[PDB]
Coordinates of C-alpha atoms and ligand atoms in Angstrom, one line a residue:
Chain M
X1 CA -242.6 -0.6 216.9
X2 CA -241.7 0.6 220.1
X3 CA -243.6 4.0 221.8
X4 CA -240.9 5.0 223.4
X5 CA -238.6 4.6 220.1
X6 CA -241.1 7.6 218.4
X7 CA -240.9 10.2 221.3
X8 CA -237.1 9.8 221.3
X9 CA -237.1 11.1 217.7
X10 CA -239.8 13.6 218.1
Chain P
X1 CA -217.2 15.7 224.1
X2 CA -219.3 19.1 225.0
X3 CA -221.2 17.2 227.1
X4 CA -217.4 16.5 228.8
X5 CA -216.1 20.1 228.1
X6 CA -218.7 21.7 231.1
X7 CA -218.2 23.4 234.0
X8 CA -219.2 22.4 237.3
X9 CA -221.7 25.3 237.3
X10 CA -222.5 25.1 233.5
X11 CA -223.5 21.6 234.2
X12 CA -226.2 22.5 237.0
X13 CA -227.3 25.0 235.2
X14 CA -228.8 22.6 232.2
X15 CA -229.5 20.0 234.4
X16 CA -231.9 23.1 236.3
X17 CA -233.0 24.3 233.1
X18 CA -234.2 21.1 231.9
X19 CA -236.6 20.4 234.9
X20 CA -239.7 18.7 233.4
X21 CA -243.0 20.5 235.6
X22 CA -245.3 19.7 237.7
X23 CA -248.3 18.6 236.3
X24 CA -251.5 17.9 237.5
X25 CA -253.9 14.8 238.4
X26 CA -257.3 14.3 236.9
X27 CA -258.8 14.0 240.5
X28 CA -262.6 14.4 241.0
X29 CA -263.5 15.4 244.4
X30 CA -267.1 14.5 244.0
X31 CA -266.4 10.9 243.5
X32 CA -265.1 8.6 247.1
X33 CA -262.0 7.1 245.5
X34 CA -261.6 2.7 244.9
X35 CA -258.9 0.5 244.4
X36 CA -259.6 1.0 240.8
X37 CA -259.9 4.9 240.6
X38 CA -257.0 5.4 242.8
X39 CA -254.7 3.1 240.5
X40 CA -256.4 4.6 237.1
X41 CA -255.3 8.3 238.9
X42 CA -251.9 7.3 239.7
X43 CA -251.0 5.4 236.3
X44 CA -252.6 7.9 234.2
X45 CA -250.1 10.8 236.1
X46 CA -247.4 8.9 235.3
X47 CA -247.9 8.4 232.2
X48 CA -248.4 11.9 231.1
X49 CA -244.6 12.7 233.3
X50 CA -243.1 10.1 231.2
X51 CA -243.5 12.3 228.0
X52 CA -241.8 14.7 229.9
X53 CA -239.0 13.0 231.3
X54 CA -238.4 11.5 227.6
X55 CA -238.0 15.3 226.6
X56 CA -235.8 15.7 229.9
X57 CA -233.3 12.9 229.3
X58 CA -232.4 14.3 225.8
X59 CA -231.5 17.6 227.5
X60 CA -229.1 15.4 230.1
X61 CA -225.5 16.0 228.7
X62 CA -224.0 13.3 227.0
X63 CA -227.3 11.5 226.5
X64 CA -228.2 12.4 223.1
X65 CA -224.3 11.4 222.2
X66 CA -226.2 7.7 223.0
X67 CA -227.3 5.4 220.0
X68 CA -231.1 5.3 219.8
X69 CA -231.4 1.6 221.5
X70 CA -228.9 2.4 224.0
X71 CA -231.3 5.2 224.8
X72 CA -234.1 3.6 224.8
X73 CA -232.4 0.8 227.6
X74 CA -231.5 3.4 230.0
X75 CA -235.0 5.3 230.0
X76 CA -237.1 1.3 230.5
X77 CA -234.8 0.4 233.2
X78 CA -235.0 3.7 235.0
X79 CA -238.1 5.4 234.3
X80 CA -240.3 4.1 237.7
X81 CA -236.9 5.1 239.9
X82 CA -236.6 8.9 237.8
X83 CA -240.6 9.4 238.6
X84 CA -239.8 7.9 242.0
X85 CA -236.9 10.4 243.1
X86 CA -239.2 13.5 241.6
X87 CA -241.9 12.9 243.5
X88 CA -239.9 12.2 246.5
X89 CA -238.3 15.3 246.4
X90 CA -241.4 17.6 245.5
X91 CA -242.9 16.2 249.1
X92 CA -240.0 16.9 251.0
X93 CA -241.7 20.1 252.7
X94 CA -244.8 18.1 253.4
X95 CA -243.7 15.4 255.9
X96 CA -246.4 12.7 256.3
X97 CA -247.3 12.7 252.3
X98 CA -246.9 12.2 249.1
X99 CA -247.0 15.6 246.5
X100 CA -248.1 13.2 243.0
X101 CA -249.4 16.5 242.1
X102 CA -250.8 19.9 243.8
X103 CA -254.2 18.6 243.7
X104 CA -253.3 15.2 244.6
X105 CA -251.6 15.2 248.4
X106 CA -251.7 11.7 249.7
X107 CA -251.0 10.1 253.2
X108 CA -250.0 6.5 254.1
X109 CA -254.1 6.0 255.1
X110 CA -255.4 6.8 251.2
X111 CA -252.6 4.3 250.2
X112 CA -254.6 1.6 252.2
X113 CA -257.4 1.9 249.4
X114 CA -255.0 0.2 246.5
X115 CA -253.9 -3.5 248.5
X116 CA -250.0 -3.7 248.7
X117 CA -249.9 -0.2 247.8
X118 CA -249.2 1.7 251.6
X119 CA -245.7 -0.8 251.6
X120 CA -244.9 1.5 248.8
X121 CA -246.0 4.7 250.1
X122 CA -244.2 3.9 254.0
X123 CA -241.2 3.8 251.7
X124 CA -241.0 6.7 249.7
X125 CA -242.3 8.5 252.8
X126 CA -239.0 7.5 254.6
X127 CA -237.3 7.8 252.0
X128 CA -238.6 11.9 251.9
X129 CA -238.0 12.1 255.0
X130 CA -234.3 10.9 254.6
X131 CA -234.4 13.7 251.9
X132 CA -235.5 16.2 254.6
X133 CA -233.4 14.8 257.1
X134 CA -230.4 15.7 254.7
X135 CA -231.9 19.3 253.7
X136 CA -231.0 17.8 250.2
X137 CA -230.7 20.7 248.0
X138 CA -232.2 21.0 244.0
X139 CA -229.0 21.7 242.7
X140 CA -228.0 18.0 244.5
X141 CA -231.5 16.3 243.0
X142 CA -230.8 17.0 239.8
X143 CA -227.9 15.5 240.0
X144 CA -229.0 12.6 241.4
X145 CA -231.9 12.2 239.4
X146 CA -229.3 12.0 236.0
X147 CA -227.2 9.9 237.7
X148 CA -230.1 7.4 238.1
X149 CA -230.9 7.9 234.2
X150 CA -227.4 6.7 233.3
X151 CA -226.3 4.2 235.6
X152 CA -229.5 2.2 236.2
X153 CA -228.8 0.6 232.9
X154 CA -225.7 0.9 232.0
X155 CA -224.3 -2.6 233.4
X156 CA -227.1 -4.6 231.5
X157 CA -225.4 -3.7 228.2
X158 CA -216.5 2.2 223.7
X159 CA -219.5 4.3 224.7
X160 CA -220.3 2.7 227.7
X161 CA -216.7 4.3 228.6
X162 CA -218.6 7.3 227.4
X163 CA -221.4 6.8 230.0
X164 CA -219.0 6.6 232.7
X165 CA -217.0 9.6 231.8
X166 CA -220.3 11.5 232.1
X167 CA -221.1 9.8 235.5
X168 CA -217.8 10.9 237.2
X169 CA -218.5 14.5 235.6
X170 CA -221.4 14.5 237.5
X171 CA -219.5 13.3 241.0
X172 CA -217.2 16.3 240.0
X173 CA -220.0 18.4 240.4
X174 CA -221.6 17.0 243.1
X175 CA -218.3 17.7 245.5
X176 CA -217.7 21.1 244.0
X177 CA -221.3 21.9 245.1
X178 CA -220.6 20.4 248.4
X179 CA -217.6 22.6 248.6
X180 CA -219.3 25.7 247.1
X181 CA -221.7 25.4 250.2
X182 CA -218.5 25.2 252.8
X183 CA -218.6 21.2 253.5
X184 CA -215.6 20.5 255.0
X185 CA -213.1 18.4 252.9
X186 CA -214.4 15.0 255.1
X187 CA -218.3 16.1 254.9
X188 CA -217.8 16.0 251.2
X189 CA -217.3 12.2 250.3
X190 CA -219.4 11.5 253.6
X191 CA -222.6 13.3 252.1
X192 CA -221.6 11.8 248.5
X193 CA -222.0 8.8 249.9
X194 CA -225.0 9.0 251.9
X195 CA -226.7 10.7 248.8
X196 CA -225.4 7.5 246.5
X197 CA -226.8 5.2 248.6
X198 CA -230.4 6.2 248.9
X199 CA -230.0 5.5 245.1
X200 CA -230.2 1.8 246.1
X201 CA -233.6 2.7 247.9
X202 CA -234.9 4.1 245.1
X203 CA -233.7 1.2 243.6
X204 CA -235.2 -1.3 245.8
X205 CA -238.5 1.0 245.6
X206 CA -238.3 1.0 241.7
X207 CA -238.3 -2.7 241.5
X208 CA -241.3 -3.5 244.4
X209 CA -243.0 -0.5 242.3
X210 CA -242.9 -2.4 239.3
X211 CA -244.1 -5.6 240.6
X212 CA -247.2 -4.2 242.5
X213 CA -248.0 -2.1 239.1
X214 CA -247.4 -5.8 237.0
X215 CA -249.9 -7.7 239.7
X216 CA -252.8 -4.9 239.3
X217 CA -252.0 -5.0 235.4
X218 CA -252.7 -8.4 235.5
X219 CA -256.1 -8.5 237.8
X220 CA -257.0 -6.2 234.7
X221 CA -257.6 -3.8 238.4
X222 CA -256.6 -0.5 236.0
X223 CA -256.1 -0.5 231.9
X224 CA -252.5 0.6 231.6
X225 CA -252.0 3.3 228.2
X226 CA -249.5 1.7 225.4
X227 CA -246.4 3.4 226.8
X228 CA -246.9 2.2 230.2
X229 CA -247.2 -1.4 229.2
X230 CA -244.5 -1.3 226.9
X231 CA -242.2 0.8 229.9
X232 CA -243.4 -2.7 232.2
X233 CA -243.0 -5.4 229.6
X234 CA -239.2 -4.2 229.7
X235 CA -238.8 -5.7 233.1
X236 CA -239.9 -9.2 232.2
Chain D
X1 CA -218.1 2.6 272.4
X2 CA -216.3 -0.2 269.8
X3 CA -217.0 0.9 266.1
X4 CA -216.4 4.6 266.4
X5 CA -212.7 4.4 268.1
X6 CA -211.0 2.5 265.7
X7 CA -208.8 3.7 263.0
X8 CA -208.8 3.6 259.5
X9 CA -206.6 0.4 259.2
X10 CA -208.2 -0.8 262.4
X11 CA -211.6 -0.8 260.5
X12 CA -209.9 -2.4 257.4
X13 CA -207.8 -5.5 259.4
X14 CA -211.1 -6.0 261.5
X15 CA -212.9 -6.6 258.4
X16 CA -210.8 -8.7 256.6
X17 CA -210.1 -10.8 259.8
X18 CA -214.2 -11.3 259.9
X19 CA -214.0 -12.4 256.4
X20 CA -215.8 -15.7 256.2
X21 CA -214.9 -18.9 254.3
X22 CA -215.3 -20.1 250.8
X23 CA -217.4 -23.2 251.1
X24 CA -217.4 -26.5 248.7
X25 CA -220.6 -27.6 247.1
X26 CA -222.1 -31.3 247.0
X27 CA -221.3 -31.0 243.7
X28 CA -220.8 -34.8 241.6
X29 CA -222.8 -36.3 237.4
X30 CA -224.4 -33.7 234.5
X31 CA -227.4 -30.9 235.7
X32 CA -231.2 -31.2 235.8
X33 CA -233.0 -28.6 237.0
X34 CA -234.1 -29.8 240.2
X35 CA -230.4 -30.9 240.8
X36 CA -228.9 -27.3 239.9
X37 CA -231.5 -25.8 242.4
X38 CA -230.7 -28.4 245.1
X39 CA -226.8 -27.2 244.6
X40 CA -227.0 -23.5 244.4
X41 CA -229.7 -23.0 247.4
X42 CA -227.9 -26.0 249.7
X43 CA -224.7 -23.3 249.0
X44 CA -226.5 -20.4 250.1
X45 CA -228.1 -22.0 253.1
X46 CA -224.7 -23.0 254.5
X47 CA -223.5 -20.0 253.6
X48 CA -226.6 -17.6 255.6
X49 CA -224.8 -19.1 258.9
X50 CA -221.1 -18.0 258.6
X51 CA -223.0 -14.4 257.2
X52 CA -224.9 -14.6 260.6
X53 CA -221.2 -14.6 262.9
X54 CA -219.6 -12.3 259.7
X55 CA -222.3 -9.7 260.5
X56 CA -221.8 -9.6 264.3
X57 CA -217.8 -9.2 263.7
X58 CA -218.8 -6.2 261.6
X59 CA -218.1 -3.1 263.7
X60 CA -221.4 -1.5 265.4
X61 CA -223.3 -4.4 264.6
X62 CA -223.5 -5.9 268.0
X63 CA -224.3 -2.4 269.6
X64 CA -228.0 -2.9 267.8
X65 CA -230.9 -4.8 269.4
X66 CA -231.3 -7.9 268.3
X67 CA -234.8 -6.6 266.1
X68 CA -232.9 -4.3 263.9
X69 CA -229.7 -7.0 263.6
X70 CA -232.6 -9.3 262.2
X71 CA -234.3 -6.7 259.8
X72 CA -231.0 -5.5 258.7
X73 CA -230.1 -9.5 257.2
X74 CA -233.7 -10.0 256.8
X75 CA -233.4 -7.3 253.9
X76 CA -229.3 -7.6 252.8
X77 CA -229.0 -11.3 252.8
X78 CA -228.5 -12.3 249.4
X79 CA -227.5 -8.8 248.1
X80 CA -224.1 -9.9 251.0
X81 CA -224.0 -13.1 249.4
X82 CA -224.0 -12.0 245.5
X83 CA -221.7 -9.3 245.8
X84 CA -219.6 -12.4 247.7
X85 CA -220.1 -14.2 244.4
X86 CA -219.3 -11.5 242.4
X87 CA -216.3 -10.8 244.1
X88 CA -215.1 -14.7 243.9
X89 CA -216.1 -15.1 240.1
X90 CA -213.3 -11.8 239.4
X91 CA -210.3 -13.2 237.7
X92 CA -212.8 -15.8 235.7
X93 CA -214.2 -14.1 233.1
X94 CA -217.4 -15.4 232.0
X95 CA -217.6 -17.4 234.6
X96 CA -219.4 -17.6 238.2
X97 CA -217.5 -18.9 241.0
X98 CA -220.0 -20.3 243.2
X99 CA -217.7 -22.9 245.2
X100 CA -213.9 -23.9 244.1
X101 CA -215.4 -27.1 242.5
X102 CA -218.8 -25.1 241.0
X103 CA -217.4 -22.9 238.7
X104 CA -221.3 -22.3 236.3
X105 CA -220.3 -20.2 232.4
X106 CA -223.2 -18.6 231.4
X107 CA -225.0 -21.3 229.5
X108 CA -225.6 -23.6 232.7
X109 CA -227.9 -20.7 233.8
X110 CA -230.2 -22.0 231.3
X111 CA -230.9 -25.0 233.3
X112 CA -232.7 -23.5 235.4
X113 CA -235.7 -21.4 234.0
X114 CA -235.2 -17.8 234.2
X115 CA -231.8 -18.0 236.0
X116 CA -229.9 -17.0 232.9
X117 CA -231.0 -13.2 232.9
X118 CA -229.7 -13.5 236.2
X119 CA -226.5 -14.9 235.7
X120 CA -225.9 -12.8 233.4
X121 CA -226.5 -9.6 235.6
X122 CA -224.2 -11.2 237.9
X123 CA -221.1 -11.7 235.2
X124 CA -221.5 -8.4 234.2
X125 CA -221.0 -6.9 237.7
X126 CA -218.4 -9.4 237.9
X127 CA -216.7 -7.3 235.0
X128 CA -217.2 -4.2 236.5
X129 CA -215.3 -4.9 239.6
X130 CA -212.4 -6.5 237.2
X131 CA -212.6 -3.1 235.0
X132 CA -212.5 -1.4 238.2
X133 CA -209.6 -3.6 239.9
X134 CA -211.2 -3.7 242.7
X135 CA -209.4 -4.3 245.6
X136 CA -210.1 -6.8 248.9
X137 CA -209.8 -4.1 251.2
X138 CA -212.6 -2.4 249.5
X139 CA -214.8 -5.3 248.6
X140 CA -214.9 -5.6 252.5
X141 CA -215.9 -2.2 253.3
X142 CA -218.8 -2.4 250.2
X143 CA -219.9 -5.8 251.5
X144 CA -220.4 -4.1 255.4
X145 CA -222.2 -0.8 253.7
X146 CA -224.9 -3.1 252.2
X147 CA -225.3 -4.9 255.7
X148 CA -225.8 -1.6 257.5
X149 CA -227.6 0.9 254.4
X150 CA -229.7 -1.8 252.7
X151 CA -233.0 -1.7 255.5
X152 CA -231.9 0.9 257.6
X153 CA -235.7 1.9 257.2
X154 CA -237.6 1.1 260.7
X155 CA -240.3 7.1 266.0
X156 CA -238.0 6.2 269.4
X157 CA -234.9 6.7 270.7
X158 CA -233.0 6.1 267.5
X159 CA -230.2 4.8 267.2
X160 CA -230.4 4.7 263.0
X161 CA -227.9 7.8 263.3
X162 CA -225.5 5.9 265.0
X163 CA -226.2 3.4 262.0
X164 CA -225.1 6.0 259.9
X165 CA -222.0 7.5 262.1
X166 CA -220.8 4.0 261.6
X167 CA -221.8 4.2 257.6
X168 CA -219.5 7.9 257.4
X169 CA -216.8 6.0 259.5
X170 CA -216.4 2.7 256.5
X171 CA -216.5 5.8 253.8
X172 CA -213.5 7.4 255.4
X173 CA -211.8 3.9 255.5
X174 CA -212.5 3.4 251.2
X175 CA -211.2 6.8 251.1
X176 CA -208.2 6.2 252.9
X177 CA -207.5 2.9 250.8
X178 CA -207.5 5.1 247.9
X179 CA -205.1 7.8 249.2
X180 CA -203.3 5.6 250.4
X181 CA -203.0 3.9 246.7
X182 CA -202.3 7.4 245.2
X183 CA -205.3 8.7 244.1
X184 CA -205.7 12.3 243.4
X185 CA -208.3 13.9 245.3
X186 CA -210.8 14.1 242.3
X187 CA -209.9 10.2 241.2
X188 CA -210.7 9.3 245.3
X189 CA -214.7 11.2 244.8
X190 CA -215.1 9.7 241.6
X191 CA -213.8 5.8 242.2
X192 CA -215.9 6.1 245.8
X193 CA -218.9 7.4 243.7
X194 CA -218.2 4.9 240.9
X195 CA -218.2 1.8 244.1
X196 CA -221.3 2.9 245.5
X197 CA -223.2 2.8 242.3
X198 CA -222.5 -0.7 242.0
X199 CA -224.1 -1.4 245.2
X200 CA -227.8 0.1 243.2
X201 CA -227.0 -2.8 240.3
X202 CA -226.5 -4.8 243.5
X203 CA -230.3 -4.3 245.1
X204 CA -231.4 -4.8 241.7
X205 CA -230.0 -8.1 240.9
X206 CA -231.0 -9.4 244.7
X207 CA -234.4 -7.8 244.0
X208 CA -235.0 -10.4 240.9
X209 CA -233.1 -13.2 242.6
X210 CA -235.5 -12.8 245.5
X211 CA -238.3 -12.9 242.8
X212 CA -237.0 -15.8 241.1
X213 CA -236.3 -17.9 244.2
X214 CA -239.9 -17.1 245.8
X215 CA -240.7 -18.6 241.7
X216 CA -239.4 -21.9 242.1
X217 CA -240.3 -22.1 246.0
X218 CA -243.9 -20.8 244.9
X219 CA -244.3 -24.5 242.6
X220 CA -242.1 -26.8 244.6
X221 CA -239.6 -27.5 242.0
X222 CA -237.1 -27.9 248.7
X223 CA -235.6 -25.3 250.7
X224 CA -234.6 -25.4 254.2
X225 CA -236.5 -23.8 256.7
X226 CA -233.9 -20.8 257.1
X227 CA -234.3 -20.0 253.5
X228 CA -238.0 -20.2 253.6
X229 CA -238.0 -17.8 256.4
X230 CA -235.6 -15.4 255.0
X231 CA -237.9 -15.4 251.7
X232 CA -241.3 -14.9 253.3
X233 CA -239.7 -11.8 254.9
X234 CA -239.1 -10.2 251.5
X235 CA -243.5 -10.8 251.0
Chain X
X1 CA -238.8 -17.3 267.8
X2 CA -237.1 -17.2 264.4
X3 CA -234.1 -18.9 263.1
X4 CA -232.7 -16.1 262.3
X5 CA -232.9 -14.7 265.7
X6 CA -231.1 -17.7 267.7
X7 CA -228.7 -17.7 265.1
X8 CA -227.8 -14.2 266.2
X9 CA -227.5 -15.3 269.9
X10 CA -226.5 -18.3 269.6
Ligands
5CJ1 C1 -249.4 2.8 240.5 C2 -248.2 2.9 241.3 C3 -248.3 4.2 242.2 C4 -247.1 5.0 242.4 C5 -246.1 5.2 241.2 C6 -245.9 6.7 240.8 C7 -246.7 7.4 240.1 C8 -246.5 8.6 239.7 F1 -247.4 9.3 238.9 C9 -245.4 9.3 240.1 O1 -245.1 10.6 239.8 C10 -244.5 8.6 240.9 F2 -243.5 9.2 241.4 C11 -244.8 7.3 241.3 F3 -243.9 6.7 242.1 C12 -246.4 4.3 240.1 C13 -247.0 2.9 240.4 C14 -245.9 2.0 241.0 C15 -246.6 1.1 242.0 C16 -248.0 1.6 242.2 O2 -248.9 0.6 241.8
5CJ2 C1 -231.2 -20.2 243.5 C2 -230.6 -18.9 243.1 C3 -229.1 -19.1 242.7 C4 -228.1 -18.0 242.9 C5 -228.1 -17.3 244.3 C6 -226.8 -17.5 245.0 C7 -226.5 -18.6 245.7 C8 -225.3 -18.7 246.4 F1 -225.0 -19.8 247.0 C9 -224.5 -17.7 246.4 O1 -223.3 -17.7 247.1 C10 -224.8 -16.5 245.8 F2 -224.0 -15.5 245.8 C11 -226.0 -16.4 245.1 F3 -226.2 -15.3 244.5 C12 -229.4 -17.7 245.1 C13 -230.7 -17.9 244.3 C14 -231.2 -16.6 243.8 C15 -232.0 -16.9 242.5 C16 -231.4 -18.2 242.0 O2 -232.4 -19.0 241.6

């Protein structure tokens, strides 16, 4: 999915 | 709430403590620089900042309270006008230039190598120089620089009540800093407004940012990283 | 002198006096796209000359030279009329008042491609100022910040600060609406802060209406040579 | 010149 949707969790 | 429950000064303090750094470029002195280099220097910088500013926003009060789309809305609409504001304000003390990074000092003539690209620079260099003009101070930037991260978005949507509650937090702080530093009752709405409207510069810079980066994109002038492309596809 | 001497309400009864007037489309029978073009720019090009006489009744205007009166509605024009728009389309929700017999909902922004995201920029700013209950008195006094902030980006004998003498004197008049309506101090910082924010979503949404209006003139789907001329100073 | 700039005069 979105990139930016990962670094917001990690 | 706790984002709601802060201080004036507990508020600036995490917004101070949260400061993503200053990184550097990956520019090579023994190479003349091309439209191409210039653009793959540029891009590649602010790609690596944007893993920091993602890190940033979370540490912005009242933005982790945000569902996971809603943050996610907020950082694509604003991220070009965040990166914008920083760099802006990190060449304030070095009138004439832009400060993308300490080994990467640029005036209006090296923006002549990238076509369409010294509209851009004339701007943020006024724009710095409006910032200079002000003696803006950092407790004021990073105000200003949340207050981009929230609102940039937040009309192209009960939590965006929540937003807004954070926002006028914010303005609370803004004043009592004004106050703090002896502003007269009259200088302190006057200065919050002239420091809410360069917002719409950055705005306006933001958005003739984002179509210059789309058009060299689309010349296939620089390879833009998966992130980036994904951060541009938002605006169309 | 002018500008600078007058009073609060002074600055408040000159702008609403300089107010200009809501204008009738050709309108009528059902849309093409061609057709809902023709309708919406013909508006805005009648409207671009009462803006013209508006801006010179707005106070400090005229004391600029005639180059910076240009570049100023060179770069605010259709950011003055949307926020018009905006402002008119209020108390219909859903709805954009363009002219009293052009009332567009949201779906006839599909009739033209790539107006809808648009339209839809513009409704929701629309419900802003409706959440807000915004007031005439400061619609006016946003509508003349936009005029004098939006390009007041030129080394001379400046000038620019008296720009901005004039830009402190129309926050001291929002203020004084708001004091004047009972506002505690903290409610008149944040509602001032919360007005001028808008003005941001207000750049943005004339920033992609400028995009999308270069689009259509860009492929000849026939603007008149004001338009085209206000447009080729945004490239 | 410009439109724009007789309008203003004119
Ligand atoms: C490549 C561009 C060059 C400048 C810009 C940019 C990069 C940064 F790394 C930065 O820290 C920053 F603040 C910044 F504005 C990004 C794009 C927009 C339009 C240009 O084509
Ligand atoms: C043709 C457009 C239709 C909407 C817009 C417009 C027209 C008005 F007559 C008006 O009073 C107004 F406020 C306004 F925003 C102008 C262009 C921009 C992009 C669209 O395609």
């Amino acid at each position: 999915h979105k990139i930016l949707h990962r670094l917001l969790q990690d | 709430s706790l984002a709601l429950s802060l201080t004036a000064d507990q508020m600036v303090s995490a917004l101070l403590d949260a400061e993503p750094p200053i990184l550097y470029s990956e520019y090579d002195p023994t190479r003349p620089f091309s439209e191409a280099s210039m653009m793959g220097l540029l891009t590649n910088l602010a790609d690596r900042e944007l893993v920091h500013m993602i890190n940033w926003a979370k540490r912005v009060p009242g933005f982790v309270d945000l569902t996971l789309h809603d943050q996610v809305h907020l950082l694509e609409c604003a991220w070009l006008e965040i990166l914008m504001i920083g760099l802006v304000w990190r060449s304030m003390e070095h009138p004439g230039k832009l400060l993308f990074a300490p080994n990467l000092l640029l005036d209006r003539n090296q923006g002549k190598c990238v076509e369409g690209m010294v509209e851009i620079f004339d701007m943020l260099l006024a724009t710095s120089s409006r910032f200079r003009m002000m003696n803006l101070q950092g407790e004021e930037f990073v105000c200003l620089k949340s207050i981009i991260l929230l609102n940039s978005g937040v009309y192209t949507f009960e939590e965006k009540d929540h937003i807004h509650r954070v926002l006028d937090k914010i303005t609370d702080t803004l004043i009592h800093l004004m106050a703090k530093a002896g502003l007269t009752l009259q200088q302190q709405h006057q200065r919050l407004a002239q420091l809410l409207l360069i917002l719409s510069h950055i705005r306006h810079m933001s958005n003739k940012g984002m179509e210059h980066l789309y058009s060299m994109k689309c010349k296939n002038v620089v390879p833009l990283s998966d992130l980036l492309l994904e951060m541009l596809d938002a605006h169309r």
